[PDB]
Amino acid sequence: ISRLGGPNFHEIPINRPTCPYHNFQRDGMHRMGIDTNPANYEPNSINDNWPRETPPGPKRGGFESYQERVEGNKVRERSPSFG
Amino acid sequence: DSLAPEDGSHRPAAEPTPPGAQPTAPGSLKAPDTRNEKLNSLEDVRKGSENYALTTNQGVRIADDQNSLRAGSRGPTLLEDFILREKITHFDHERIPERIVHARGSAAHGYFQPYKSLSDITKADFLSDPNKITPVFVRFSTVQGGAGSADTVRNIRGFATKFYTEEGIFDLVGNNTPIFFIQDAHKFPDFVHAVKPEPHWAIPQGQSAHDTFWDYVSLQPETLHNVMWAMSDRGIPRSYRTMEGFGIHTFRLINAEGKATFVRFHWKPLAGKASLVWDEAQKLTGRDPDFHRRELWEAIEAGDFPEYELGFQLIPEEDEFKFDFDLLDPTKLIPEELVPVQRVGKMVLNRNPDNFFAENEQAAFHPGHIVPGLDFTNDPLLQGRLFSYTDTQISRLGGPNFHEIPINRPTCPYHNFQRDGMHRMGIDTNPANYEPNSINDNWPRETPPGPKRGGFESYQERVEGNKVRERSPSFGEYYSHPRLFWLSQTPFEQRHIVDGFSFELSKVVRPYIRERVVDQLAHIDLTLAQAVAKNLGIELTDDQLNITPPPDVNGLKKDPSLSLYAIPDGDVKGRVVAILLNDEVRSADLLAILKALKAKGVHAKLLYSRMGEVTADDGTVLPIAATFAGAPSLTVDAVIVPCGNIADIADNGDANYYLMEAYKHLKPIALAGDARKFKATIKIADQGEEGIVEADSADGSFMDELLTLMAAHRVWSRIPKIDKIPA
Amino acid sequence: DSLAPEDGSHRPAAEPTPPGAQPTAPGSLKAPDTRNEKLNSLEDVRKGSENYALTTNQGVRIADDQNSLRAGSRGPTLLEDFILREKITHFDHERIPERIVHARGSAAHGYFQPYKSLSDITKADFLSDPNKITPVFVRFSTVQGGAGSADTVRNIRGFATKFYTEEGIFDLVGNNTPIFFIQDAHKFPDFVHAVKPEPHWAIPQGQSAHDTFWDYVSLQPETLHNVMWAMSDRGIPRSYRTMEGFGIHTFRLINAEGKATFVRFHWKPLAGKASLVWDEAQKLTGRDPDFHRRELWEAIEAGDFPEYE
Amino acid sequence: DSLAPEDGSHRPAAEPTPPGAQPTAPGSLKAPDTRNEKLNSLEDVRKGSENYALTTNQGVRIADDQNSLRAGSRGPTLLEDFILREKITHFDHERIPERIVHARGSAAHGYFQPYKSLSDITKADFLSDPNKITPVFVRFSTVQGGAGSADTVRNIRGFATKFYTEEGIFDLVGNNTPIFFIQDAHKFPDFVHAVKPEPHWAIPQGQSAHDTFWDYVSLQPETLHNVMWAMSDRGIPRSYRTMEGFGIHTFRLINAEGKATFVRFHWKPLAGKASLVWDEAQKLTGRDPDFHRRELWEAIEAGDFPEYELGFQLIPEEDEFKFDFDLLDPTKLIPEELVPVQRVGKMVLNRNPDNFFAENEQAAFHPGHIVPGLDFTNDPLLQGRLFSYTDTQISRLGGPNFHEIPINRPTCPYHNFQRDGMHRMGIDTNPANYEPNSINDNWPRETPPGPKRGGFESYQERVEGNKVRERSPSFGEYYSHPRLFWLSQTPFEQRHIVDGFSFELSKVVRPYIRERVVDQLAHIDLTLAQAVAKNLGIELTDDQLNITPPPDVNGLKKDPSLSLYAIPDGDVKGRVVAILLNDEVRSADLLAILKALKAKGVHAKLLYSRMGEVTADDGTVLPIAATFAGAPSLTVDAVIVPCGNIADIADNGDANYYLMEAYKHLKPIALAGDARKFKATIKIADQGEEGIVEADSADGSFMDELLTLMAAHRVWSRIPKIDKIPA
Ligand code: HEM
Ligand code: HEM
Ligand code: HEM
Q: Are residues D327 and D365 in the same domain?
A: yes
Long-range contacts of D198-205 (CB under 8 A, 24+ apart): D205/D144, D205/D145, D205/D146, D205/D149
**Whose CA is closest to atom 15 on ligand 3?**
D139
CB pairs under 8 A between C and D: 61
Q: Is B438 within the bounds of a domain?
A: no
Q: Are residues D377 and D246 in the same domain?
A: yes
Q: Are residues D562 and D613 in the same domain?
A: no
Q: Name the residue among B193, B218, B394 with its Cβ closest to that of A40.
A: B193
CA–CA separation, D357 and B249 (whole Å): 41
CA–CA separation, D603 and D637 (whole Å): 10
**Whose CA is closest to atom 39 on ligand 1?**
B99
Q: Is C93 within the bounds of a domain?
A: yes
CA–CA separation, B52 and D416 (whole Å): 9
3 state SS for B581-640: CCCCECHHHHHHHHHHHHHHCCEEEEEECCCCEEECCCCCEEECCEECCCCCHHHCCEEE
Q: Is B223 within the bounds of a domain?
A: yes
* B389 carries a ligand binding annotation: yes
By three-state DSSP, how is residue A16 classified? coil
**CB-ligand 2 contact for C248 (6 Å cutoff):** yes
Pocket-forming residues, ligand 1, beta carbon under 6 Å:
B 99-102, 105, 139, 141, 158, 160, 173-175, 180, 185, 188, 248-249, 330, 363-365, 381, 384-385, 388-389, 392-393, 396; C 88, 92
Does residue B175 carry a catalytic annotation?
yes
Catalytic residue among B102, B225, B292, B366: B102
Instruction: Say if CB C34 and CB A42 are below 8 A apart.
Output: no
Domain of D555, in residue numbers: 470-573
Read off the CATH number of the domain in which B716 is found: 3.40.50.880
Q: Are residues B509 and B629 in the same domain?
A: no
- Give which of D401, D337, D411 is closest to D111, Cα–Cα: D411
Q: Which residues of C touch B465 (CB under 8 A)?
A: 70-75
Q: Is D558 within the bounds of a domain?
A: yes
For B458-473, the DSSP string reads: ----EEEEEEE----G
Q: Are residues B272 and B127 in the same domain?
A: yes
Q: What pairs with residue B626 in β-bridges?
A: B607
Phi, psi (rounded to 5 degrees) for C154 = -85, 120
- In angstroms, what is the span from residue B101 Cα to ligand 1's centroid? 7
Helix (H) or strand (E) holding C297: helix C291-302
Q: What is the dihedral sign for C-alpha B148, B149, B151, B155? A: negative
Burial class of residue B311 in the structure, from the number of CB atoms within 10 Å of its CB (0-12 exposed, 13-18 middle, 19+ buried): buried
CA dihedral D672, D673, D677, D680 (to 10 degrees): 50
**Whose CA is closest to atom 28 on ligand 3?**
D385
Q: Is D547 within the bounds of a domain?
A: yes
CA–CA separation, D241 and D106 (whole Å): 12
Q: How far apart, in Å, do the first and last CA atoms of chain C sit?
A: 49
- In angstroms, what is the span from residue B64 Cα to ligand 2's centroid? 24
**CB-ligand 2 contact for C106 (6 Å cutoff):** no
- In angstroms, what is the span from residue D189 Cα to ligand 3's centroid? 12
Burial class of residue B507 in the structure, from the number of CB atoms within 10 Å of its CB (0-12 exposed, 13-18 middle, 19+ buried): middle
CB atoms within 10 A of CB D651: 9
Q: Is C76 within the bounds of a domain?
A: yes
By three-state DSSP, how is residue B125 classified? helix
- CB contact under 8 Å between A69 and B466, yes or no, is yes
The one-character DSSP state at B427 is E
Burial class of residue C119 in the structure, from the number of CB atoms within 10 Å of its CB (0-12 exposed, 13-18 middle, 19+ buried): middle
CA–CA separation, D724 and D727 (whole Å): 9
Q: Name the residue among D77, D435, D438 with its Cβ closest to that of C79.
A: D77
The one-character DSSP state at C262 is E
- CA-to-CA separations, D638 to D58, D671, D708, in angstroms, rounded: 54, 11, 11
The shortest C-alpha distance from C157 to chain A (Å) reads 26
Q: Is C7 within the bounds of a domain?
A: no
Q: Name the residue among D61, D391, D443 with its Cβ closest to that of B49.
A: D443
Radius of gyration of chain C from its Cα atoms, rounded to whole angstroms: 24
The shortest C-alpha distance from D435 to chain C (Å) reads 6
CA–CA separation, D622 and D718 (whole Å): 33
Nearest 5°: CA angle at B404, between B402 and B410?
110
CA–CA separation, C33 and C54 (whole Å): 28
The B-side interface with A (CB below 8 A) comprises 189-191, 193-194, 198-200, 211-212, 215-216, 218-220, 391, 394-395, 399, 422, 457-469, 510, 512-513
Residue C102: partners with Cβ closer than 8 Å, 6 or more residues away: C141, C142, C143, C158, C160
Whether cis (ω within 30° of 0) applies to the bond prior to B372 is no
Residues C57-76, buried b or exposed e (16+ Cβ, 10 A)?
beebbbbbbbbbbbbbbbbb
Read off the CATH number of the domain in which B561 is found: 1.20.1370.20
Q: Are residues B579 and B726 in the same domain?
A: yes
Beta strands across the sheet bearing B692-695: B626-627, B603-608, B576-580, B638-641, B669-672, B692-695
Q: Are residues B70 and B122 in the same domain?
A: yes
CA–CA separation, B282 and D694 (whole Å): 100
- CA-to-CA separations, B680 to B654, B685, C289, in angstroms, rounded: 15, 8, 35
CA D300 to chain centre: 14
- Give which of B180, B324, B160 is closest to B250, Cα–Cα: B180
Which residue is closest to D95 within chain A, CA to CA? A3
Instruction: Say if CB D252 and CB D373 are below 8 A apart.
Output: no
Q: Are residues D512 and D617 in the same domain?
A: no
**Whose CA is closest to atom 5 on ligand 2?**
C174
**Could you give the residue ranges of the DSSP H alpha helices within D570-683?**
587-599, 647-650, 653-664
Catalytic residue among B36, B109, B155, B175: B175
Q: Is C6 within the bounds of a domain?
A: no
CA–CA separation, D178 and B317 (whole Å): 78
**CB-ligand 2 contact for C264 (6 Å cutoff):** no
- Give which of D176, D281, D177, D203 is closest to D499, Cα–Cα: D281
Instruction: Say if CB B4 and CB D432 are below 8 A apart.
Output: no
Give the determination technique.
X-ray
Domain boundary among D518, D545, D573: D573
Of the CA atoms within 13 Å of residue B153, those in its CB half-sphere come to 31
Instruction: Say if CB B602 and CB B591 are below 8 A apart.
Output: no
Does residue D175 carry a catalytic annotation?
yes
Resolution at which this structure was determined, Å:
1.9
Q: Are residues B387 and B533 in the same domain?
A: no
**Whose CA is closest to atom 13 on ligand 2?**
C160
Domain boundary among B382, B410, B438: B410
Residue A55: partners with Cβ closer than 8 Å, 6 or more residues away: A61, A62, C63
For B367-422, the DSSP string reads: TT---TTEE----HHHHHHHHHHHHHHHHHTSSTTGGGSGGG--SS----S----T
Angle between helices D224-231 and D491-506 (to 10 degrees): 100
- Which one of the ligands is nearest to B407 CA? 1
Read off the CATH number of the domain in which B197 is found: 2.40.180.10
Domain boundary among B573, B607, B642: B573
- Give which of B467, B151, B457 is closest to B294, Cα–Cα: B151
Instruction: Say if CB B386 and CB B58 are below 8 A apart.
Output: no
Q: What pairs with residue B466 in β-bridges?
A: A69
Strands D603-608, D626-627: parallel, antiparallel or unpaired by DSSP?
parallel
3 state SS for D138-200: EEEECCCCCCCCCCCCCCCCEEEEEEEECCEEEEEEEECCCCCCCCCHHHHHHHHHHHCCCCC
- Which one of the ligands is nearest to B177 CA? 1
Helix (H) or strand (E) holding D513: helix D511-522
CA–CA separation, D318 and B671 (whole Å): 88
- Give which of B468, A5, B142 is closest to D93, Cα–Cα: A5
Burial class of residue B463 in the structure, from the number of CB atoms within 10 Å of its CB (0-12 exposed, 13-18 middle, 19+ buried): buried
Q: Are residues D663 and D539 in the same domain?
A: no
- CA-to-CA separations, B279 to B153, B500, B627, C167, in angstroms, rounded: 11, 10, 21, 54
CA–CA separation, C101 and C103 (whole Å): 5
- Give which of C172, C158, C307, C141 is closest to C247, Cα–Cα: C172
Instruction: Say if CB D216 and CB D190 are below 8 A apart.
Output: yes
Q: Name the residue among D67, D69, D76 with its Cβ closest to that of A78.
A: D67
The A-side interface with D (CB below 8 A) comprises 2-3, 68, 70-81
- CA-to-CA separations, B364 to B393, B406, D424, in angstroms, rounded: 7, 11, 14
Structural domain count of chain C: 1
Q: Are residues B39 and B130 in the same domain?
A: yes
Q: Which atom of ligand 3 is nearest to the CA of D140?
A: 15
CA–CA separation, B464 and B483 (whole Å): 34
Instruction: Say if CB B532 and CB B526 are below 8 A apart.
Output: no
Q: Which residues of D touch C222 (CB under 8 A)?
A: none
Q: Are residues B615 and B657 in the same domain?
A: yes
Residues B356-388, buried b or exposed e (16+ Cβ, 10 A)?
bbbbbbbbbbbbbbbbbbbbbbbbbbbbbbbbb
Q: Which residues of C touch D75 (CB under 8 A)?
A: 71
Instruction: Say if CB C252 and CB C289 are below 8 A apart.
Output: no
CA–CA separation, C58 and A21 (whole Å): 7
